[PDB]
Write a protein that binds this ligand. Structure first.
Ligand SMILES: [Mg+2]
Ligand SMILES: [Mg+2]
Lengths: 212, 4, 244, 240, 250, 235, 222, 233, 231
């Protein structure tokens, strides 16, 4: 996997690939690694496919119960801490998760929490997570500015996943893109690397290592 | 179990 | 089933009283009077024994005054056996605190936990309450000298001077009359004994029908000493204040 | 375990053990809560058949549950300690998991839930306590005042009183409290609270406690003279 | 099935009495007289072996029991209740003391443990109080000789001398006349034998009287030699013969 | 005394029958089922004018497609609601769908007789459970502490119930619009209520397939109240 | 040391059309280099127009299928005879599998039927309950041989429009049931040629709005 | 977590036109020691089922007791116990299969491979296998251990598919089974010469033959084999 | 009187009054009828409503493909007992691959009910059940009472005024017992039996409830327009 999420001027960008592997066997190229918890909350998946999928849809149920009981949408901090306190109970049992809980609330503003299965929970503006995280970081970090336009931010996120999809053998398939604002999350499409790579190579003039 |  | 024989020890009367607590208090009202008086430089505990026989071994005896730790003691009015159960609990609780924090337990904290135990017997479990009221006398470096009482309800309150057991009505009136804030320990010793002397149901107060303790700073410099009086020491303090 | 169903229904549909717990509240010393425009005030009667009391160490009647919420009560004193401890633990646990202190409504709902649980569990009697819970939600300046009772029902009050002669002082507040214009300041609100207590209390001597709670964890207990001043000032406006 | 009696059977009445403790004391009142006297170099405890049938062999029924090598007990009230208390008392001397400190408990502390057991029968669910009062005579290095009375409530008191049961009121009066702080153990045995005749109806000999002492160490009763710091049990039951020897010089 | 689980000679459970008396003392709650939605309305019954009436919560969301109104010992309903919400959300987790209204109601009703010498007494509160699902459409259920539940086209519970039920008997027909049903709940409430009905001492709610369960604000309810007087005056 | 798992071989394959879906599997059952049976079915009609196969360790496969069939039974009992939709079955099966996360069912699970709009659906699961809907999935021993063939022939991967300079992809389109059965039969004969654990027989369950039909074909027995 | 001690080798079986045959030798081995020789490894249940067991004998004896208790339990409050509510082979199998899989799931298996052979009440032949892992399967021929390797290929020459069953008489099928038992005695180092055989026929019922022996063995050619390559005398 | 405080107390004439009071809730229950031939078994139940705005309480519950029951009395108690039956039928399938004998279902219910008539704190079940099914020995009808007594019958009825139907079935026996291979005729006879227990009311379309099980019919329930055929 490769997943990222970064904060900027215009909210949060979330971008992920769609590959699942069992060793070198490519098991799927069409995994939905972003889970839509509520209209203002997103979770990203990396690590064990089942672990991530199961506990992150379980997380959605817990967030729903919060708002029934408290007549109010759950904070990103509280939602992320439910997941991190859950996995911490299982510490040592061999759960494998690297997740980011991404969302907006009025009390918090746009917020990202990195949560993994060792029980680490970190608030931050930029994270990349998965086997391809370093590749994504390399592109993302060297073009990141707080002031990126929504247009540029979306592309950088998309381009960073592409970078990782290309170099990391265990990332690929397609890029899924989200933008999160004060009004909630907005989906910005599924982008097959099959066509996206060649489109980016041509239009951007990058990827000269590759036989054109 | 496959991974991501 | 067995429901037939259940007295229901933890219910309310139609007036909203706890029968068993009330009846336990009634039991305590026939117990030997115990008095606590708090001075600026120490505390007195004085208590009257339930009417002696001449053949009772009076020096190796303890019925009223118990040591909880080095800085805290209690005076008992009620069932002795019930009180010992609670006393060992309190002693252990003091040691847990010391072990945990490396500091002697603050007096109130000890008093609260004992009172919380009593409270439990009035709300759940279907058991009879403990037929005991305590006067707690102790020192800690937050509040200094403190007197408290607890009773079978598990309610506790703090005092400058207080009595428990028999004739507390007469005793409380007398303490109220003669007590004053700037009092020294040796004055409080006298007040305690004079109060028992007048409220006693016996003909006259003698050394062999008493237990007595002080908690002073009267060791050496900024540290505290418990003195549980020997019989001969009470006999002397009874002469020294002219009751015999 | 001791199992007996002590709180049960009677033929008329009443739960006598809950209703008798209310009688224990009725016998308790009076407590009143009044919320201003920007503060909440908690006033408590202390029965004056007691001198030789040590007030330094005697359990005060208003308890901080967290640094922004206070709870007072009328009824059995020993019972109230149990509810306060549970409430205090929950306050810390809420901070630990939600990373936010409790709302006053949440904390009230919790205490209320505990009280209700004790009305349909075997081997236990209900709490002989009703509570007034007051404070300000985190990052909020709108004052909150709630009341709970042995049955478990809870609700919000512009002002409310519980304990003995509470009907006399509820009577007072009902004609003296304007929903439209709540005591616009601390000074104003403390006064109305003391007035209502003077309907029932005796001397305003060592008989009245007042605790004021303002927003952002600003809680302070008034001491004798500060209260005494209020008492003095009302009787001097009384001869008219 | 199982014990659904988890509530107290002893509760306060409106006057404040605990009925079952009072009634247990009444059962002790009915009981045969027993007594204890404390001398300067010993303690004596004695009672009447009032037999149920003369076909019964009353040596097989011991009313005076060894608890530790330096502690003994006698009772008045219900015999079966006493028997299980002795069983429990012996065991608690080991589990809560000897197995911890490698030595036997001092008298007051063993007494304290028995009292705890009896207090629990006064408050725990589904039980009645014990229908007995005990007299426990004992010796330990730092307290010397001591005598305690334990009642159904769990209360205990130290005595110079006392008596319990049937003719206790009379016997306590007798003991006030005779007791002084200079009694040598033989004098205490003698007084105990005089006091006990007042309350015994029928035969009065070493086969109807049970009597034990806490006195000197008995190396001959130890069972082994070679550890010079182990000197033997201070508890000794007087034989049928030993008692009759003291009844001729009565 | 006598066991909590005892039968009367008529073959009824004393404790269940006595809890039904407690429910008669409760404030009135009314529900009406239409083909356009289900309305739920209740009498708030503030015990004193100082008590802030919006804090009285006798209508409650269970899930987006299910709502609840209560009458009787309302504190007893907290755990029933909690169970209902968990049951609904859990079902969606296990099956990726909305839980049926009847299944929800049956789940809540399973709690009811779990008392004895489990809880110490039956619940002292009746529930009106209203929702929508794709199979059986709009539904209204009356859930009692006996563990029994009945589907209704319309139903009243609480003190004013026998009067209000007779009224609902006359007024309900299979073609009521939602707006007709809202007015009708308001009308029947004003009839059986002690004090004079206004937007502060009564509350309305509905559940529609399209927008799910909504509690009406006081501004919206006040206008339906005004619309109701003008309908009655005008003939 | 006792090893609680075994491997019974075989392979399965699910394809979904516009108004139908198929779930096929070979009927051979093996351990090591021995044949246990040449006809032991592992694709099952589970009711409510759902077919299911759980291929790998047969004992685990049978246990799971049994549990799901039972789950369908109770779904009727508890929810007024309501039809269990394929999406709801899938989610239920995730919980069945993940419930044994720390002692897994060693199976690759596939279910097939119709979604709520009457369109053909195939869902596949990893051994601990990760799942996903697809047009297409092979599972079990020969999965790695068959799956890339299906990417090419069902989803037209790496196939372009002739003379468009590799710029216009072959356009996606649903297959007829006749075409799908051809791909299934060829998939299995190819798999039989090159995988020793695949052979003997092929059983196909086809699911349409009129129910579940079966077709059987002989496969090479070596 | 177990290891088998006293063990039984192959159990072999097949369907024929009217019923099923099943056989197994009477040996209980103890490693390479052929320790016990009078061991019956075919256990009949009613008059319609035989359960043949290989693997750990202590676990086999446990299973015997379960089956004999099952018969008892089925008779309880059952007036049709010897008629419509008699135990079927499919009931007995599923019960065993359930137990085997539960025991493997508790990491404490019954160290056996089991073949349940019989005839259902409607006359259908029942032949199904289950082992320590709870793995189950049906085939016209079934065998365990070396039997799977050496008997199956021989028995499948007779019944190679479903349609071959009607064409197979009980004489033909018993011949194949008895021949297969000889081969196993030639080639399995933990087989014995003595064995039992049972036929469950839908007409004649259960025939249980004890104390069979492998006969007509070819050993004569052994005399012509000298040395291991170049040696002559 | 002094002996009806709980189930664990016998009266001086050897009666169990709590069990008898449980039996009484059955008597207040709406009527339901069971009857069978050799090929099928039928349940008919009169459903009762709260008022004209309410549903008509279901009285028939499916237990398996070959078994099910009707209830009279406390409905939650039928839910508990029917759920137990579902499990027992289920256990028989998963473990033995065997459809549970209706007779065993009977014995299992008897033993479940009995436990609640001998132990303190519990209470007897307050519902009567009529169990029908088709198994390896044909069609069956059982009558369950919460005393624990279960009885196999050709036909019967329980609830208020069930004595009308039970008399009718007693005369009709020789006829209905031999309605083989004809579902609709057996049902007709059942509907007529229940009609002998009606007073001031007759069978409407959302009032009648029928179930049938037999040789080649899974236990199925008919309500609403599906029963109009029979009125
Ligand atoms: Mg790659
Ligand atoms: Mg092959």
């Amino acid at each position: 996997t490769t997943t990222l999420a970064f904060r900027f001027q215009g909210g949060i960008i979330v971008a992920v690939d769609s590959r699942a592997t069992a060793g070198n066997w490519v098991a799927s190229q069409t995994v939905k690694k972003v889970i839509e918890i509520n209209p203002f909350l997103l979770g990203t998946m990396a690590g064990g496919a089942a672990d991530c999928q199961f506990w992150e849809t379980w997380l959605g149920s817990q967030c729903r119960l919060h708002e029934l009981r408290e007549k109010e949408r759950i904070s990103v901090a509280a939602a992320s801490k439910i997941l991190s306190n859950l996995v911490y109970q299982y510490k040592g049992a061999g759960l494998s998760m690297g997740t980011m809980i991404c969302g907006y609330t009025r009390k918090e503003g746009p917020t990202i929490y990195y949560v993994d299965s060792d029980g680490t929970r970190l608030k931050g503006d930029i994270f990349c997570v998965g086997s391809g995280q370093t590749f994504a970081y390399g592109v993302l970090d060297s073009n990141y500015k707080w002031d990126l336009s929504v247009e540029d931010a979306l592309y950088l996120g998309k381009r960073s996943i592409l970078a990782a999809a290309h170099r990391d053998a265990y990332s690929g398939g397609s890029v899924n893109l989200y933008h999160v604002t004060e009004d909630g999350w907005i989906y910005h499409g599924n982008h097959d690397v099959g066509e996206l790579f060649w489109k980016v190579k041509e239009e951007e003039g990058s990827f000269n290592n590759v036989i054109g | 179990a496959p991974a991501x | 089933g067995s429901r037939r024989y259940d007295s229901r020890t933890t219910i309310f009367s139609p007036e909203g009283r706890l029968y068993q607590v009330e009846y336990a208090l009634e039991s305590i009202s026939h117990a030997g009077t115990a008095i606590g008086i708090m001075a600026s430089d120490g505390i007195v505990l004085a208590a009257e024994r339930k009417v002696t026989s001449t053949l009772l071994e009076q020096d190796t005896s303890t019925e009223k005054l118990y040591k909880l730790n080095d800085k805290i003691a209690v005076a008992v009015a009620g069932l002795t056996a019930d009180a010992e159960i609670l006393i060992n609990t309190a002693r252990i609780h003091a040691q847990n605190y010391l072990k945990t924090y490396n500091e002697d337990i603050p007096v109130e904290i000890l008093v609260r936990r004992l009172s919380d135990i009593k409270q439990g017997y009035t709300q759940h479990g279907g058991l009879r309450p403990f037929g005991v009221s305590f006067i707690y006398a102790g020192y800690d470096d937050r509040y200094g000298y403190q007197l408290y009482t607890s009773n079978p309800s598990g309610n506790y309150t703090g005092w400058k001077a207080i009595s428990v057991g028999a004739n507390t009505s007469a005793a409380q009136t007398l303490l109220q009359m003669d007590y004053k804030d700037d009092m020294k320990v040796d004055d409080a010793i006298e007040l305690a004994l004079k109060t028992l002397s007048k409220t006693t149901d016996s003909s006259a107060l003698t050394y062999d029908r008493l237990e007595f303790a002080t908690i002073r700073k009267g060791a050496n410099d900024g540290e505290v000493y418990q003195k549980i009086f020997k019989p001969q020491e009470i006999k002397d303090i009874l002469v020294k204040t002219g009751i015999t | 375990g001791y199992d007996r169903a002590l709180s049960i229904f009677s033929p008329d549909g009443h739960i006598f053990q809950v209703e008798y717990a209310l009688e224990a509240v009725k016998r308790g010393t009076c407590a009143v809560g009044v919320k201003g425009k920007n503060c909440v005030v908690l006033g408590c009667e202390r029965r004056s058949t007691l001198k030789l009391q040590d007030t330094r160490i005697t359990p005060s009647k208003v308890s901080k549950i967290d640094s922004h919420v206070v709870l007072s009560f009328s009824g059995l004193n020993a019972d109230s300690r149990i509810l306060i401890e549970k409430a205090r633990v929950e306050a810390q646990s809420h901070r630990l998991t939600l990373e936010d202190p409790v709302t006053v409504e949440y904390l009230t709902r919790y205490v209320a839930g505990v009280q209700q649980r004790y009305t349909q569990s075997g081997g236990v009697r209900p709490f002989g306590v009703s509570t007034l819970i007051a404070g300000f939600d985190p990052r909020d300046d709108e004052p909150k005042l709630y009341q709970t009772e042995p049955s478990g029902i809870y609700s919000s009050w512009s002002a409310q009183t519980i304990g003995r002669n509470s009907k006399t002082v509820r009577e007072f507040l009902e004609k003296n409290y304007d929903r439209k214009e709540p005591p616009a300041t601390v000074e104003e609100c403390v006064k109305l609270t003391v007035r209502s207590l003077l309907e029932v209390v005796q001397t305003g001597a060592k008989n009245i406690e007042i605790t004021v709670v303002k927003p952002d964890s600003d809680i302070v207990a008034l001491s004798s003279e500060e209260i005494n001043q209020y008492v003095t000032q009302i009787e001097q406006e009384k001869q008219e | 099935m199982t014990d659904r009696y988890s509530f107290s059977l002893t509760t306060f009445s409106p006057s404040g009495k605990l009925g079952q403790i009072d009634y247990a004391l009444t059962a002790v009142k009915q009981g045969v007289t027993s007594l204890g006297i404390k001398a300067t170099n010993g303690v004596v405890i004695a009672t009447e072996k009032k037999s149920s049938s003369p076909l019964a062999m009353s040596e097989t029924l011991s009313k005076v029991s060894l608890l530790t090598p330096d502690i003994g007990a006698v009772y008045s009230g219900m015999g079966p209740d006493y028997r299980v208390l002795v069983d429990k008392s012996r065991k608690v001397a080991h589990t809560s003391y000897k197995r911890i400190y490698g030595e036997y408990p001092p008298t007051k502390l063993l007494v304290s443990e028995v009292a705890k057991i009896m207090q629990e029968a006064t408050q725990s669910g589904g039980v009645r109080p014990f229908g007995v009062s005990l007299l426990i005579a004992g010796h330990d290095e730092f307290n010397g000789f001591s005598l305690y009375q334990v009642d159904p409530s769990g209360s205990y008191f130290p005595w110079k001398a006392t008596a319990i049961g049937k003719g206790s009121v009379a016997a306590k009066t007798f003991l006030e006349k005779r007791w002084n702080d200079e009694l040598e153990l033989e004098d205490a045995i003698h007084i105990a034998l005089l006091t006990l005749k007042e309350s015994v109806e029928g035969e009065f000999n070493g086969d109807t009287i049970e009597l034990a002492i806490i006195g000197d160490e008995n190396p001959d009763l130890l069972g082994y030699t070679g550890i010079p710091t182990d000197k033997g049990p201070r508890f000794r039951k007087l034989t049928s013969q030993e008692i009759n020897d003291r009844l001729e010089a009565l | 005394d006598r066991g909590v689980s005892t039968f009367s000679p008529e073959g009824r459970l004393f404790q269940v029958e006595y809890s039904l008396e407690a429910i008669k003392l409760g404030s009135t709650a009314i529900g009406i089922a239409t083909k356009e939605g289900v309305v739920l309305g209740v009498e708030k019954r503030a015990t004193s004018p100082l008590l802030e009436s919006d804090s009285i919560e006798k209508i409650v969301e269970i899930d987006r497609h299910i709502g609840c109104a209560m009458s009787g010992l309302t504190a007893d309903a907290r755990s029933m609601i909690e169970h209902a919400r968990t049951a609904a959300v859990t079902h969606n987790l296990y099956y990726d769908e909305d839980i049926n209204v009847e299944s929800l109601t049956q789940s809540v009703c399973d709690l009811a007789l779990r008392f004895g010498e489990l809880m110490s007494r039956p619940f002292g509160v009746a529930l009106l459970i209203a929702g929508h699902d794709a199979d059986d459409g709009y539904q209204l259920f009356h859930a009692e502490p006996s563990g029994t539940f009945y589907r209704y086209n319309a139903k009243a519970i609480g003190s004013g119930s026998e009067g209000a039920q007779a009224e609902l008997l006359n007024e309900w027909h299979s073609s009521l619009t939602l707006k007709e049903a809202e007015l009708l709940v308001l009308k029947i409430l004003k009839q059986v209520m002690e004090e004079k009905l206004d937007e502060n001492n009564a509350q309305l709610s509905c559940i529609t397939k399209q927008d799910g369960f909504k509690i009406y604000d006081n501004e919206k309810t006040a206008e339906l109240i005004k619309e109701l007087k003008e309908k009655e005056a005008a003939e | 040391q006792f090893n609680p798992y075994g491997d019974n071989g075989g392979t399965i394959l699910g394809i979904a059309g516009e108004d139908f879906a198929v779930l096929a599997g070979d009927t051979r059952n093996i351990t090591d280099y021995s044949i246990n049976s040449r006809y032991e079915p592992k694709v099952f009609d589970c009711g409510d127009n759902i077919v299911m196969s759980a291929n790998g360790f047969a004992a685990d496969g049978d246990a799971l299928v049994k549990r799901f069939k039972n789950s369908v039974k109770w779904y009727h009992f508890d929810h007024n005879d309501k039809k269990l939709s394929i999406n709801s079955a899938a989610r239920n099966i995730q919980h069945l599998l993940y419930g044994k996360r720390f002692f897994p069912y060693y199976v690759h699970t596939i279910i097939a039927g119709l979604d709520e709009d009457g369109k053909g659906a195939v869902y596949s699961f990893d051994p601990v309950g990760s799942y996903e809907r697809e047009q297409c999935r092979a599972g079990g021993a020969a999965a790695s041989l068959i799956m890339p063939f299906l990417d090419n022939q069902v989803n037209f991967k790496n196939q372009y429009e002739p003379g468009t300079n590799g710029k216009v992809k072959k356009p996606l389109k649903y297959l007829s049931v006749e075409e799908v059965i051809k791909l299934v039969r060829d998939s299995f004969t190819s798999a039989t040629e090159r995988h020793i654990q695949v052979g003997d027989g092929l059983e196909i369950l086809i699911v349409t709005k009129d129910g579940v039909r079966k077709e059987f074909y002989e496969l090479k027995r070596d | 977590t177990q290891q088998p001690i006293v063990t039984g080798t192959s159990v072999i079986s097949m369907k024929y036109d009217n019923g099923v045959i099943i056989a197994a030798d009477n040996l209980g081995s103890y490693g390479s020691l052929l320790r016990f020789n009078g061991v019956e490894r075919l256990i009949p249940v009613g008059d319609n089922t035989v359960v043949g067991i290989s693997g750990d004998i202590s676990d086999m004896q446990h299973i015997e007791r379960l089956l004999k208790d099952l018969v008892t339990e089925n008779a309880y409050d059952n007036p049709l116990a010897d008629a419509e509510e008699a135990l079927e082979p499919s009931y007995i199998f599923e019960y065993l299969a359930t137990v085997m899989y539960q025991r493997r799931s508790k990491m404490n298996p019954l160290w056996n491979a089991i073949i349940v052979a019989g005839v259902q009440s409607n006359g259908d032949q029942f032949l199904r296998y289950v082992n320590l892992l709870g793995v189950t399967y049906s085939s016209p021929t079934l065998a365990t251990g070396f039997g799977a390797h050496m008997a199956n290929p021989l028995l499948r020459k007779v019944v190679d598919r479903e349609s071959d069953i009607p064409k197979t008489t009980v004489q033909v099928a018993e011949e194949a089974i008895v021949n297969a038992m000889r081969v196993l005695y030639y080639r399995d180092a933990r087989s014995s010469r003595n064995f039992s055989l049972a036929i469950i026929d839908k007409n004649t019922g259960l025939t249980f033959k004890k104390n069979l022996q492998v006969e007509n063995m070819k050993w004569d050619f052994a005399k012509d084999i000298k040395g291991y390559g170049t040696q002559k005398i | 009187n002094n002996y009806d405080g709980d189930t664990v107390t016998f009266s001086p004439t050897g009666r169990l009054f709590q069990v008898e009071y449980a039996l009484e809730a059955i008597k207040q229950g709406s009527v339901t009828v069971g009857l069978r031939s050799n090929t099928h078994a039928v349940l008919v139940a009169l459903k009762r409503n709260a008022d004209e705005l309410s549903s008509y309480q279901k009285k028939i519950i499916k237990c398996d493909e070959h078994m099910g029951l009707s209830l009279a009395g406390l409905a939650p108690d039928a839910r508990v007992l029917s759920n137990y039956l579902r499990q027992q039928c289920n256990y028989s399938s998963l473990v033995f691959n065997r459809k549970l004998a209706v007779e065993r279902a009977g014995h299992l219910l008897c033993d479940k009910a009995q436990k609640n008539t001998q132990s303190y704190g519990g209470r007897p079940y307050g519902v009567g059940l009529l169990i029908i099914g088709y198994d390896k020995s044909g069609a069956h009808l059982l009558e369950f009472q919460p005393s624990g007594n279960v009885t196999e019958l050709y036909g019967t009825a329980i609830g208020a005024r069930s004595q009308g139907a039970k008399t009718y079935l007693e005369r009709t026996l020789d006829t209905f017992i031999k309605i083989d291979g004809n579902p609709d005729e057996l049902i007709k006879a059942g509907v007529e039996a229940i009609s002998q227990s009606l007073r001031d009311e007759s069978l409407t379309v959302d009032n009648l409830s029928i179930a049938i099980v037999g040789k080649d019919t899974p236990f199925t329930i008919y309500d609403g327009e599906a029963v109009a055929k029979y009125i």
